[PDB]
Design a protein around this motif. Sequence first.
Motif, PDB file in Angstrom:
ATOM      1  N   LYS A 185       0.785  -1.225   0.000  1.00  0.00           N
ATOM      2  CA  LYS A 185       0.000   0.000   0.000  1.00  0.00           C
ATOM      3  C   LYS A 185       0.826   1.288   0.000  1.00  0.00           C
ATOM      4  O   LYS A 185       0.682   2.118  -0.897  1.00  0.00           O
ATOM      5  CB  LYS A 185      -0.966  -0.003   1.191  1.00  0.00           C
ATOM      6  N   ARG A 186       1.692   1.462   0.993  1.00  0.00           N
ATOM      7  CA  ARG A 186       2.484   2.686   1.064  1.00  0.00           C
ATOM      8  C   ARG A 186       3.380   2.873  -0.156  1.00  0.00           C
ATOM      9  O   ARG A 186       3.642   3.995  -0.562  1.00  0.00           O
ATOM     10  CB  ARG A 186       3.327   2.727   2.349  1.00  0.00           C
ATOM     11  N   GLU A 204      -7.763   0.572   9.931  1.00  0.00           N
ATOM     12  CA  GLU A 204      -8.071   0.491   8.476  1.00  0.00           C
ATOM     13  C   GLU A 204      -8.816  -0.795   8.107  1.00  0.00           C
ATOM     14  O   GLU A 204      -9.938  -1.027   8.557  1.00  0.00           O
ATOM     15  CB  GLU A 204      -6.783   0.579   7.646  1.00  0.00           C
ATOM     16  N   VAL A 205      -8.166  -1.617   7.285  1.00  0.00           N
ATOM     17  CA  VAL A 205      -8.703  -2.884   6.789  1.00  0.00           C
ATOM     18  C   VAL A 205      -9.813  -3.535   7.620  1.00  0.00           C
ATOM     19  O   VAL A 205     -10.997  -3.282   7.390  1.00  0.00           O
ATOM     20  CB  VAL A 205      -7.565  -3.910   6.595  1.00  0.00           C
ATOM     21  N   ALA A 206      -9.432  -4.383   8.572  1.00  0.00           N
ATOM     22  CA  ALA A 206     -10.408  -5.070   9.411  1.00  0.00           C
ATOM     23  C   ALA A 206      -9.766  -5.732  10.626  1.00  0.00           C
ATOM     24  O   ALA A 206      -8.557  -5.965  10.655  1.00  0.00           O
ATOM     25  CB  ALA A 206     -11.152  -6.113   8.586  1.00  0.00           C
ATOM     26  N   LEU A 207     -10.590  -6.029  11.627  1.00  0.00           N
ATOM     27  CA  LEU A 207     -10.126  -6.670  12.857  1.00  0.00           C
ATOM     28  C   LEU A 207      -8.976  -5.935  13.546  1.00  0.00           C
ATOM     29  O   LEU A 207      -8.090  -6.561  14.134  1.00  0.00           O
ATOM     30  CB  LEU A 207      -9.716  -8.120  12.572  1.00  0.00           C
ATOM     31  N   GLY A 208      -8.996  -4.607  13.474  1.00  0.00           N
ATOM     32  CA  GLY A 208      -7.953  -3.820  14.105  1.00  0.00           C
ATOM     33  C   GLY A 208      -6.623  -3.884  13.380  1.00  0.00           C
ATOM     34  O   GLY A 208      -5.610  -3.403  13.889  1.00  0.00           O
ATOM     35  N   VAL A 209      -6.618  -4.494  12.197  1.00  0.00           N
ATOM     36  CA  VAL A 209      -5.402  -4.591  11.395  1.00  0.00           C
ATOM     37  C   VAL A 209      -5.401  -3.435  10.395  1.00  0.00           C
ATOM     38  O   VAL A 209      -6.364  -3.246   9.645  1.00  0.00           O
ATOM     39  CB  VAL A 209      -5.334  -5.924  10.628  1.00  0.00           C
ATOM     40  N   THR A 210      -4.322  -2.660  10.392  1.00  0.00           N
ATOM     41  CA  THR A 210      -4.224  -1.518   9.495  1.00  0.00           C
ATOM     42  C   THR A 210      -3.292  -1.791   8.326  1.00  0.00           C
ATOM     43  O   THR A 210      -2.479  -2.719   8.365  1.00  0.00           O
ATOM     44  CB  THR A 210      -3.704  -0.268  10.234  1.00  0.00           C
ATOM     45  N   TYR A 211      -3.410  -0.971   7.287  1.00  0.00           N
ATOM     46  CA  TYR A 211      -2.559  -1.127   6.125  1.00  0.00           C
ATOM     47  C   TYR A 211      -1.097  -0.996   6.518  1.00  0.00           C
ATOM     48  O   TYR A 211      -0.226  -1.620   5.910  1.00  0.00           O
ATOM     49  CB  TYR A 211      -2.943  -0.112   5.049  1.00  0.00           C
ATOM     50  N   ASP A 212      -0.831  -0.200   7.548  1.00  0.00           N
ATOM     51  CA  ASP A 212       0.533  -0.033   8.025  1.00  0.00           C
ATOM     52  C   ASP A 212       1.029  -1.363   8.575  1.00  0.00           C
ATOM     53  O   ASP A 212       2.167  -1.764   8.315  1.00  0.00           O
ATOM     54  CB  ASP A 212       0.598   1.046   9.104  1.00  0.00           C
ATOM     55  N   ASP A 216       4.023  -3.172   6.863  1.00  0.00           N
ATOM     56  CA  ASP A 216       5.194  -3.473   7.689  1.00  0.00           C
ATOM     57  C   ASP A 216       5.481  -4.958   7.575  1.00  0.00           C
ATOM     58  O   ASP A 216       6.621  -5.368   7.371  1.00  0.00           O
ATOM     59  CB  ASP A 216       4.955  -3.115   9.160  1.00  0.00           C
ATOM     60  N   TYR A 217       4.431  -5.762   7.703  1.00  0.00           N
ATOM     61  CA  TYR A 217       4.564  -7.207   7.602  1.00  0.00           C
ATOM     62  C   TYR A 217       5.181  -7.555   6.253  1.00  0.00           C
ATOM     63  O   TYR A 217       6.119  -8.350   6.171  1.00  0.00           O
ATOM     64  CB  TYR A 217       3.187  -7.869   7.716  1.00  0.00           C
ATOM     65  N   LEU A 218       4.644  -6.948   5.195  1.00  0.00           N
ATOM     66  CA  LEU A 218       5.128  -7.191   3.837  1.00  0.00           C
ATOM     67  C   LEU A 218       6.560  -6.722   3.620  1.00  0.00           C
ATOM     68  O   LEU A 218       7.281  -7.273   2.784  1.00  0.00           O
ATOM     69  CB  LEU A 218       4.204  -6.517   2.818  1.00  0.00           C
ATOM     70  N   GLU A 219       6.972  -5.706   4.370  1.00  0.00           N
ATOM     71  CA  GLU A 219       8.329  -5.186   4.251  1.00  0.00           C
ATOM     72  C   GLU A 219       9.332  -5.991   5.083  1.00  0.00           C
ATOM     73  O   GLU A 219      10.519  -5.665   5.127  1.00  0.00           O
ATOM     74  CB  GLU A 219       8.356  -3.707   4.645  1.00  0.00           C
ATOM     75  N   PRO A 224       3.102  -7.029  16.030  1.00  0.00           N
ATOM     76  CA  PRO A 224       2.509  -7.741  17.166  1.00  0.00           C
ATOM     77  C   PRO A 224       1.892  -9.073  16.736  1.00  0.00           C
ATOM     78  O   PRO A 224       1.285  -9.166  15.668  1.00  0.00           O
ATOM     79  CB  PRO A 224       1.460  -6.756  17.674  1.00  0.00           C
ATOM     80  N   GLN A 225       2.053 -10.097  17.571  1.00  0.00           N
ATOM     81  CA  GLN A 225       1.518 -11.428  17.287  1.00  0.00           C
ATOM     82  C   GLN A 225       0.050 -11.420  16.879  1.00  0.00           C
ATOM     83  O   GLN A 225      -0.318 -12.018  15.871  1.00  0.00           O
ATOM     84  CB  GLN A 225       1.677 -12.339  18.506  1.00  0.00           C
ATOM     85  N   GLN A 226      -0.790 -10.758  17.669  1.00  0.00           N
ATOM     86  CA  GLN A 226      -2.217 -10.703  17.367  1.00  0.00           C
ATOM     87  C   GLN A 226      -2.459 -10.189  15.954  1.00  0.00           C
ATOM     88  O   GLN A 226      -3.414 -10.596  15.291  1.00  0.00           O
ATOM     89  CB  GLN A 226      -2.961  -9.818  18.378  1.00  0.00           C
ATOM     90  N   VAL A 227      -1.592  -9.293  15.494  1.00  0.00           N
ATOM     91  CA  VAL A 227      -1.716  -8.742  14.149  1.00  0.00           C
ATOM     92  C   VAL A 227      -1.183  -9.740  13.122  1.00  0.00           C
ATOM     93  O   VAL A 227      -1.871 -10.077  12.159  1.00  0.00           O
ATOM     94  CB  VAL A 227      -0.943  -7.411  14.017  1.00  0.00           C
ATOM     95  N   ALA A 228       0.037 -10.216  13.341  1.00  0.00           N
ATOM     96  CA  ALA A 228       0.659 -11.174  12.439  1.00  0.00           C
ATOM     97  C   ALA A 228      -0.149 -12.461  12.299  1.00  0.00           C
ATOM     98  O   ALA A 228      -0.195 -13.054  11.222  1.00  0.00           O
ATOM     99  CB  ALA A 228       2.068 -11.498  12.915  1.00  0.00           C
ATOM    100  N   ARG A 229      -0.788 -12.893  13.382  1.00  0.00           N
ATOM    101  CA  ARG A 229      -1.578 -14.121  13.348  1.00  0.00           C
ATOM    102  C   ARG A 229      -2.851 -13.936  12.524  1.00  0.00           C
ATOM    103  O   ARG A 229      -3.275 -14.847  11.812  1.00  0.00           O
ATOM    104  CB  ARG A 229      -1.937 -14.567  14.771  1.00  0.00           C
ATOM    105  N   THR A 230      -3.456 -12.756  12.627  1.00  0.00           N
ATOM    106  CA  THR A 230      -4.675 -12.457  11.886  1.00  0.00           C
ATOM    107  C   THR A 230      -4.357 -12.382  10.397  1.00  0.00           C
ATOM    108  O   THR A 230      -5.086 -12.915   9.563  1.00  0.00           O
ATOM    109  CB  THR A 230      -5.278 -11.111  12.312  1.00  0.00           C
ATOM    110  N   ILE A 231      -3.257 -11.710  10.078  1.00  0.00           N
ATOM    111  CA  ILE A 231      -2.817 -11.549   8.702  1.00  0.00           C
ATOM    112  C   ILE A 231      -2.546 -12.903   8.060  1.00  0.00           C
ATOM    113  O   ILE A 231      -2.964 -13.160   6.932  1.00  0.00           O
ATOM    114  CB  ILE A 231      -1.534 -10.680   8.639  1.00  0.00           C
TER     115      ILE A 231
END
Length: 255
Positions: A185-186, A204-212, A216-219, A224-231
């Motif tokens: 995105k960025r 942004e997106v959903a479930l408290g997960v933002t494009y950032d 960041d994950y993509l970069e 945070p685990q909760q974010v990485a696990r959802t992704i």
Amino acid sequence: TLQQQIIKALGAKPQINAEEEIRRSVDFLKSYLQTYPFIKSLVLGISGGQDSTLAGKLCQMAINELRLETGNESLQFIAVRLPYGVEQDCQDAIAFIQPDRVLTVNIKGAVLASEQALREAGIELSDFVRGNEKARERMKAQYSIAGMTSGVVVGTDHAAEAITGFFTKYGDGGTDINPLYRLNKRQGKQLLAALACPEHLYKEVALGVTYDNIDDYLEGKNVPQQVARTIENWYLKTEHKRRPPITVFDDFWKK
């Protein structure tokens, strides 16, 4: 690791050179058209959003250069507006892209007709499903235009979208060529900045997960685990959307 596996599968990079990525996309488009001279136009749906605006600009650039370089006057980029019934962002995007041709097709009529036919069969659709029906009607419209203008349908799919699988299968995911694939995105915003695109068009997106978080994950950064696990859950669950129809030879879906 899984994260490193996703990065490789989507071809994402930690950092990119705007000028270089603009060029890669434009030459890709130009090279494709030159390899198949019977193709005369690029068709893209314009929504007023970041992705289609960037894709639209890259398409017009490819067509502009081909005309100058080959003298072929019949090549054209066709921007399509696909409103559902009933837009300053669209207007601003179009003004920035400066497409050779703009078509407006209202899909409301067709969607209601499809639902009526379903209703008579005893099936009432939910808003969720209706959202996908719309995306698919837009896909039909673009392919009908392309069918009548010797064109191919250009898609806006990119790394930050492909990872979540947040696109309609055979809807906005149904395209021929995707010049943005590999970018997050960025990084998309980066290319638009380098192209002198009006700021309010990409900033942004959903479930408290933002494009950032997603970028960041993509970069390759730590999130945070909760974010990485959802992704990672979204990715695994939507694998069938990034692959051709399943046959007895596939195994990616097993266990």
